[PDB]
Amino acid sequence: GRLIYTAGGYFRQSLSYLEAYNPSDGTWLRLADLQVPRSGLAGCVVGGLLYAVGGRNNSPDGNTDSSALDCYNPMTNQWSPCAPMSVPRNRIGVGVIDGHIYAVGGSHGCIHHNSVERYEPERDEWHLVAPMLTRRIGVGVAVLNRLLYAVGGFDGTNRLNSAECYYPERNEWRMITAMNTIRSGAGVCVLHNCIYAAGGYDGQDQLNSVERYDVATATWTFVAPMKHRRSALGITVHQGRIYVLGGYDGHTFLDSVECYDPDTDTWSEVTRMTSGRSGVGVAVT
Ligand SMILES: O=C(O)[C@H]1CCCC[C@H]1C(=O)N1CCc2c(OCCO)cccc2[C@H]1CN1C(=O)c2ccccc2C1=O
């Protein structure tokens, strides 16, 4: 009985919502709020515990980029703060290998990070690893074949279609094939040995198209597009299906949740969030 957790987001100001969707019965749970409201964060799971990483607190009182790591235990319904990152990271990407959380790219004020760092839950310590070849904010991250892929984003001057690949054992980055479309704030995940890149922003318009990286052929190819255009969308996989949650379409903050079936190559709206939002962090446990 794994649930889809969504944490934080933005709608007029940065949000503190933690809510859990159940794809079996379609119910939404109302869990303990984040201690600090955050947008542009990322979510992940290690050892049955949900982690909220980075982001930014937009309010009427002002703006503050977050270096925070906070840990949620579904058994206790309690948020506990963890050791902070070396620097604040808004519009962050996150991935997990051997129960270690990688925090990739993002912004602090005018700075656009190429730097990367790794968290050890057993020691409660962050440590820097080799930096990315490109500065990326709004970067999508995916873990495949025990390698951490960084996909798309924004380097301060240009929106990016390029992508690169981290090698944990060698501690080095390597550029892979570039995407068909330029994407910042895309939903990036792994399903059936492929990296999917859904939606995002190309510089002009928000996108509904989805493309899929195959490792053997080393090529990106398009699959069925989403019903609604969206950037800054939450994304995850649950029982062999991709779920995209919310986002921004240039005018509206979406409450819509669409679900991809790779067998039929079709998207469909499975539920709606309790309110519309963009820039959420998502994970499953
Ligand atoms: O971070 C920010 O300074 C804030 C500024 C206020 C709007 C929210 C937030 C933002 O700008 N976000 C959301 C996070 C995010 C992102 O993070 C993914 C990890 O969770 C990756 C790529 C792009 C974005 C953007 C998308 N976005 C909007 O929602 C939006 C609304 C109105 C005008 C322009 C924009 C826009 O550009």
From Swiss-Prot:
Changing residue 56 to A: Loss of interaction with NFE2L2/NRF2. Abolishes repression of NFE2L2/NRF2-dependent gene expression. Impaired interaction with SQSTM1/p62. Changing residue 159 to A: Loss of interaction with NFE2L2/NRF2. Abolishes repression of NFE2L2/NRF2-dependent gene expression. Loss of interaction with PGAM5. Does not affect interaction with SQSTM1/p62. It is found in: Cytoplasm; Nucleus. This is Kelch-like ECH-associated protein 1. The record marks 110 as: Sensor for electrophilic agents. Broadly expressed, with highest levels in skeletal muscle. KEAP1 contains reactive cysteine residues that act as sensors for endogenously produced and exogenously encountered small molecules, which react with sulfhydryl groups and modify the cysteine sensors, leading to impair ability of the BCR(KEAP1) complex to ubiquitinate target proteins. The Kelch repeats mediate interaction with NFE2L2/NRF2, BPTF and PGAM5. Kelch repeats lie at residues 3-48, 49-99, 100-146, 147-193, 194-240, 241-285. It comes from the Eukaryota. Belongs to the KEAP1 family. The chain holds residues 325 to 609 of 624 of the full protein. Changing residue 26 to S: In a NSCLC cell line. It comes from Homo sapiens. Substrate-specific adapter of a BCR (BTB-CUL3-RBX1) E3 ubiquitin ligase complex that regulates the response to oxidative stress by targeting NFE2L2/NRF2 for ubiquitination. KEAP1 acts as a key sensor of oxidative and electrophilic stress: in normal conditions, the BCR(KEAP1) complex mediates ubiquitination and degradation of NFE2L2/NRF2, a transcription factor regulating expression of many cytoprotective genes. Changing residue 10 to A: Loss of interaction with NFE2L2/NRF2. Strongly reduces repression of NFE2L2/NRF2-dependent gene expression. Loss of interaction with PGAM5. The modification S-cGMP-cysteine is found at residue 110. Component of the BCR(KEAP1) E3 ubiquitin ligase complex, at least composed of 2 molecules of CUL3, 2 molecules of KEAP1, and RBX1. Interacts with NFE2L2/NRF2; the interaction is direct. Forms a ternary complex with NFE2L2/NRF2 and PGAM5. Interacts with (phosphorylated) SQSTM1/p62; the interaction is direct and inactivates the BCR(KEAP1) complex by sequestering it in inclusion bodies, promoting its degradation. Interacts with NFE2L1. Interacts with BPTF and PTMA. Interacts with MAP1LC3B. Interacts indirectly with ENC1. Interacts with SESN1 and SESN2. Interacts with HSP90AA1 and HSP90AB1. (Microbial infection) Interacts with ebolavirus protein VP24; this interaction activates transcription factor NFE2L2/NRF2 by blocking its interaction with KEAP1. Non-enzymatic covalent modifications of reactive cysteines by electrophile metabolites inactivate the BCR(KEAP1) complex. Accumulation of fumarate promotes the formation of cysteine S-succination (S-(2-succinyl)cysteine), leading to inactivate the BCR(KEAP1) complex and promote NFE2L2/NRF2 nuclear accumulation and activation. Nitric oxide-dependent 8-Nitro-cGMP formation promotes cysteine guanylation (S-cGMP-cysteine), leading to NFE2L2/NRF2 nuclear accumulation and activation. Changing residue 106 to C: In a lung adenocarcinoma patient; somatic mutation; strongly reduces interaction with NFE2L2/NRF2 and reduces repression of NFE2L2/NRF2-dependent gene expression.
